[PDB]
Fold this protein.
Amino acid sequence: DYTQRPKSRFLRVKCNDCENEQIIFGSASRKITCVVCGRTLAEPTGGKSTITTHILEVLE
Amino acid sequence: WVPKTRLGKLVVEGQVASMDEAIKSGLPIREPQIIDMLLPDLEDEVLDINMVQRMTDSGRRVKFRATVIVGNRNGYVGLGQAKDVQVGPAIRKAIDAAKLNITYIRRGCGSWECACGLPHTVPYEVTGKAGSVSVTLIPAPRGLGIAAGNTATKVLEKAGIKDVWTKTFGTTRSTLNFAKATYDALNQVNVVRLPVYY
Amino acid sequence: EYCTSCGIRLVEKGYVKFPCPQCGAEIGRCISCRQQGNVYTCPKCGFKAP
Amino acid sequence: MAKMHTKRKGKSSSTRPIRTDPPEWCKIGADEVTTIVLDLWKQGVSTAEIGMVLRDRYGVPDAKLITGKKVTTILKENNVAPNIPEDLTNLIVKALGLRKHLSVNKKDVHNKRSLNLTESKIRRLVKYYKQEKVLPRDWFYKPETAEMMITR
Amino acid sequence: VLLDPLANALSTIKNAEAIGKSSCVVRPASKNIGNVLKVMQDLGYIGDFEFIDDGKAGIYSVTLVGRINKCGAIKPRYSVGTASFERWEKQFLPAKNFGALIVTTSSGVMSQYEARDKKIGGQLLAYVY
Amino acid sequence: SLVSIDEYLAAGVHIGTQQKTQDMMRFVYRVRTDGLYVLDIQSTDERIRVASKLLSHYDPARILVVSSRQYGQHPARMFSRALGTRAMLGRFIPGSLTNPQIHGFFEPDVIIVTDPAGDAQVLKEASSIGVPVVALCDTNNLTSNVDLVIPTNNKGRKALSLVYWLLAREVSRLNDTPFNYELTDFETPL
RNA sequence: CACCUGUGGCGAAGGCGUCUUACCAGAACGGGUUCGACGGUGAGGGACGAAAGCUGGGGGCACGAACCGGAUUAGAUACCCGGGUAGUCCCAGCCGUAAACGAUGCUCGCUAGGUGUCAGGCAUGGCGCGACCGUGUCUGGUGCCGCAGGGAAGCCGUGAAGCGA
RNA sequence: AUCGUGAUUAUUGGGUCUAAAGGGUCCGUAGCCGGUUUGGUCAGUCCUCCGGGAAAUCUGACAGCUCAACUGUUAGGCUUUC
Ligand SMILES: [Mg+2]
Ligand SMILES: [Mg+2]
Ligand SMILES: [Zn+2]
Ligand SMILES: [Zn+2]
């Protein structure tokens, strides 16, 4: 095609403790801790963030 | 004369009469004694007799780089030069080489002031650069003549071109490059892409 | 006289004329489209080769 | 293109996709994101990473797509914006720190040139903003007196 | 910095013609770019062109049908009247009634033949042949 | 495919070279883990059939076949005998097609090259005279001065014998030539 | 400040090689992050600017213009060899020039390919299937090879000397 | 002498790796060059109008000097770029 697309993609990560339905960005530049209870969903790697809990489904 | 290649056999059989159908055949035209029968009306002129030399252990080698341009004054013209130990064999070798390099250049009237359309000048603007010598073939009004040099007049009168304005860039001293750049410009005459509706 | 990859005129020396390798219709190619491997598409049978 | 004072071109752009709509896979609302932006601003977080923390921990794809407003538009709407742009403040802050370092290392000519390049960028930003009325016409960038963190 | 998109588009068309490529992409599309492409299409020198938006200025997927020889911008865009086209034609163009100059005019952008028909001049935009 | 892909896998035809080119991408379907990139066998048979259609429009005594490699040498001679085409397996004189006073003079109408990179001189000579050429490239070949491309492994003996027999049988069936040669004839002496 | 060391790297250039620490700066890479044309070039003008040299204070192992001596030679005010001052080094300033070179000013779009290696990112196979190393691929550098293109040629050739601004 | 030759002053229309020629590098004002885009104006610009831009010399023809240059009429040019 001619249009550019976001090769980096979102996720649907599920919290390991509070079961929060939070949303995180895959190429995280920050420690995406859980919004609600106690958890760190993924740590900021220079490339792709290392997710610690379940990914329900990778989104666009 | 013994023809050697397929084009020679075709011309001796009578299948190929003019050089246009020989070019349509696509074979290499290598024999100098084919174009003479294909175009008996070929004419040529010696463009310079610049006597080259060369260094040896004892003395100094001498040759002649005489160049002769070949045209027919109707739309066909070719370039060719040769050298040999004597002016006679050198010019005859140049005549042999030139007649093998004849090409067909289409002509018309693309001048901004001329409006005839009948073929008397260049179809449009083109360029010929052999070495640093460069020539632009701007169209000229009918019944005017060639606005170029003496050797340019000879080469474009052999090629059949009648009225042209031009201009020269770079060292124009070399008459050989002048003839070759005129050849390059004439070959770029019939290679530019024209509209289908024209 | 008109290439199937560029359409330029085959007035120069070295133009190759050949029928189609699929339908047999004539397809032309120039030195630049043959030195550079320009893809030629047959306008009749739609044949496309490099 | 090349950079401002070094000719090392680069293409590490952040590829934002063609999104003319808000998310359809997210239940977040405009009120939620604007409340998050205001709270993070009151914490003391600059607008560059406000959107980053929106997009990372809340997964907000873009504040303009959902709210219809960018971060600074929300800041001006709520009277929660600074009087000076963040880029000019960052350049002036770096220049002040670099001048503080250079007042004890007078041999550090390379960082003197770095200070000169940042000064050129500061004057470029001030010229653009005075062109667009963000800053006053008479307030010129004084590199010794009128360059403090909050200018008044 | 990008500061002449029409000349960039015509230089890309020149490069694509020189390689003989049937198709080529046009870097960021503009309204005058579209007007030049439409007038060139009506001249028959250029085949097809589509504005494919990309969340940006927009680009073109131009199908070059192999009908041109060279085409770049006219810099500076000279002011031209109805009695001032023939000198520009003698300069840029190679022959009478061969190739056209893209002109911008208050009536519209068009080759200078149709501008002379309109009896209205303006600024030269480009030349194609 | 006119012949099963398992036969091409067994015969070594699908093995190529560890380095490929960008213009050979269209004839490659998948990268193998070893490094040798497998070509499109369906594309190879398509090119073979198209060339045989093009080679069937001319007499075998006007075709020209050239080869350089030893592994491509025997099947080239088998092709020359089975068709009567004038083959140049082995060393090649640079002025055969040109140079009318030279031994080996020929004036063909189509040229066939067993390997375009190795047979560069034949490509230059054909381009000079203006004879369209159906070539036999590999994964590390370029199609400069080449009209038709045959994507087959020219560095495999079994692959060369199989491909030469396929081209020979295809042309001889298309042009109704009596073809009594079998692949063991075209197979290299092991 | 050796080997380590590279047809490696960083730097605006000049230039930078022991190690540790503190201070500072840029880069590329990743980035549904903030900004909204804020950009390029740029006569004047400004800072940096190799080495030599100059000014003042140090230091002086080595090296080493001058100088002295020993040979060489027709001669030797030179090459060679023995001494060796200023200087090289540091501290505070000045001069402002080099074959300061890629003998290629800087910015952008555009234009066949094959081909090392470096940074980052990314797939996958192995890896004590971990810290790590291989092949592929995008981006930005760093080299060689070269079609078209151009040049008077040597050549240049997505890192132009190609085609435009 | 001066114009042309000579694109040997080059806006048109030149070069600047090795032939004379890239500034050591760089920052950067006046100048100069500038993204796509909606909305408004119309100053340069654009078509047109009206006041001008003396004749003379210039071009062509007619008329008249025997042909001629030349004088008059006339259709154009310049006057320019208000
Ligand atoms: Mg020093
Ligand atoms: Mg320099
Ligand atoms: Zn939680
Ligand atoms: Zn005419």
User: Anything to note?
Assistant: Chain C is about 10% helix and 25% strand. The interface with chain F takes residues 13-16, 18-22, 24, 29, 31, 34-37, 47, 49-50 of chain C (CB under 8 Å). Helices of chain C lie at 31-35.
